[PDB]
Amino acid sequence: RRGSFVEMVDNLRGKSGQGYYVEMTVGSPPQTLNILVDTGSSNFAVGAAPHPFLHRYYQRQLSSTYRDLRKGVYVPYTQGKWEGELGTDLVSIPHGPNVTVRANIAAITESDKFFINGSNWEGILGLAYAEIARPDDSLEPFFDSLVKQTHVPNLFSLQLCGAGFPLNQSEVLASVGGSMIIGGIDHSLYTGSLWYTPIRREWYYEVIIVRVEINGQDLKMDCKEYNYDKSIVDSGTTNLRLPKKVFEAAVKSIKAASSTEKFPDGFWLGEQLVCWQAGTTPWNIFPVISLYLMGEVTNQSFRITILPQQYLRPVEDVATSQDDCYKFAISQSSTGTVMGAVIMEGFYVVFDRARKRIGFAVSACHVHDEFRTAAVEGPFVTLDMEDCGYN
Ligand SMILES: NC1=N[C@@]2(c3ccns3)CN(c3ncc(F)cn3)C[C@H]2CS1
């Protein structure tokens, strides 16, 4: 298998906890900024005023190509908020397609818990659809603009590379965190076959989960529960997030599978780290997790299987040690299933907008051990899969 997109391979940096970012330029002359890649939102928004956690920001007064749209945008969400001023400017991705487009840009003037101390990113690239753009769906998202203005195919693909150990801020700076291939699929980034699930509706990247197993044991819930009230693929979320009742059932099953060791409640709640002596993490006591997704062919599904090497997120010890430490990166949701960064780290994920489908293949960079690997397998005969979708 040949890799046909060398210019874009290794263009991401970062990690699941703080997010993965790509270098972009905005304005004339070009202003370089690092931008978080978020498949869970649809606005392109950049720091545009001094902030304690920003080393640089977009300076509209220094761009000859800046256009003021004379309109504010206010974006509150669960864990934070940003607000700013809408405009347009010329935008490029240096390690991307060799094109420059005129895009909507939200210039962020005020924010709360948006910029992370030491993340290295200064803005967000929302790659989902117009339906969820703010202030409304008339604000064309970046990827829409790029496709409309250029010959770039209406597809992108993400390989998010977890290190399997903690990285400090300077280690992130020096390290490759993955690839965003704009307009194509690079065959070097995966092994085995790509399997595709339909995009149910074009707003978030919404999919349908039809079965869940823990170490091969069916969680045995009504499949609507898995998709209540939606299931999405979201690079801007760290964890695998599951609806409350699914979370409760899954955690019970994961506890039962790992019962040779007892972990505190704070671990299972995603709050508290666990630590083992260097090199002794007991991967084998933790179960694999399989999610079965609706296939493209009538009555067919396929499964993606992740390891504890995906769902245990490496963190630095709260005190200086050589221990290997992790947090549990599965958590409860009241807004549906979110297949976040820790699950995307297992897989090369193809966002095939042109054919309204999402592809999954085992990542060439996934963390594993000598005994088990992540997997994408099928087909399976699965009936009444449309009934799994929530209305
Ligand atoms: N995938 C994610 N993305 C976000 C962020 C990720 C990192 N910093 S904020 C952005 N975000 C958002 N953005 C626009 C909007 F209209 C609604 N919500 C939700 C927030 C957490 S979950």
One DSSP character per residue, 279-334 reads T---GGGSPPEEEEEE-SSTTEEEEEEE-HHHHEEEE--SSS-S-EEEEE-EEEES
Q: Exposure pattern of 246-270 as b/e (b: 16+ CB <10 Å)? A: bbebbbebbeebbeeeeeeeebbeb
Query: Is the CB of 40 within 6 Å of ligand 1?
Result: yes
In this structure, the residue with its CA closest to atom 4 of ligand 1 is: 236
Judge if the beta carbon of residue 241 lies within 6 A of ligand 1.
no
> What residues form DSSP beta bridges with 324?
276
Q: Is 234 in the pocket of ligand 1 (CB under 6 A)?
A: yes
Residue among 379, 384, 29, 363 at smallest CA distance from 189: 363
* 234 classed as catalytic: yes
Place of tokens 């549906």: 336
- DSSP type of residue 42: -
Q: Are 375 and 346 in contact (CB under 8 A)?
A: no
Residue pointed to by tokens 């010329």: 90
Tell me the C-alpha distance between 311 and 305, whole Å. Answer: 11
Task: Determine how many CB atoms are found less than 10 A away from the CB of residue 151.
Answer: 8
Q: State residue 269 phi and psi, 5-degree precision.
A: -85, 0
Instruction: Please give the backbone phi and psi of residue 84, each rounded to the nearest 5 degrees, phi first.
Output: -175, -160
CB-based burial of residue 136 (10 Å sphere; 0-12 exposed, 13-18 middle, 19+ buried)? exposed
Contact call for residues 388 and 208 (beta carbons, < 8 A): yes
Active site residue 186: no
Are 204 and 234 contacting, i.e. CB atoms less than 8 angstroms apart?
A: yes
Nearest to 300 by CA among 197, 228, 193, 222: 197
Cα angle at 232 between 308 and 195, to 5 degrees? 70
**Strand partners for 381:** 300
Q: What is d(CA 391, CA 230) in angstroms, rounded to the nearest whole number? A: 9
The residues near 370 (Cβ < 8 Å, ≥ 6 apart) are none
Please name the method used to determine this structure: X-ray
Among the listed residues 186, 234, 324, 352, the single catalytic one is 234
Going by C-beta distance under 8 Å and a sequence separation of 6 or more, which residues neighbour residue 186? 3, 4, 5, 8, 9, 157, 179
Cβ contact 229:335 at 8 Å? yes
Report the distance separating Cα 34 and Cα 32, nearest Å. 7
What residue's CA is closest to ligand 1, atom 3?
236
**Which of 137, 335, 83 is CA-nearest to residue 228?**
335
Where along the chain do its domains lie? 20-152, 153-391
User: Scanning the structure block, which residue is given the tokens 């039962």?
Assistant: 256
Contact between 382 and 339 under an 8 Å Cβ cutoff? The reply is no
Token output for 288: 């694999």
Count of other CB atoms within 10 angstroms of residue 239: 24
Amino acid, res. 318: V
CB of residue 165 inside a 6 A radius of ligand 1: no
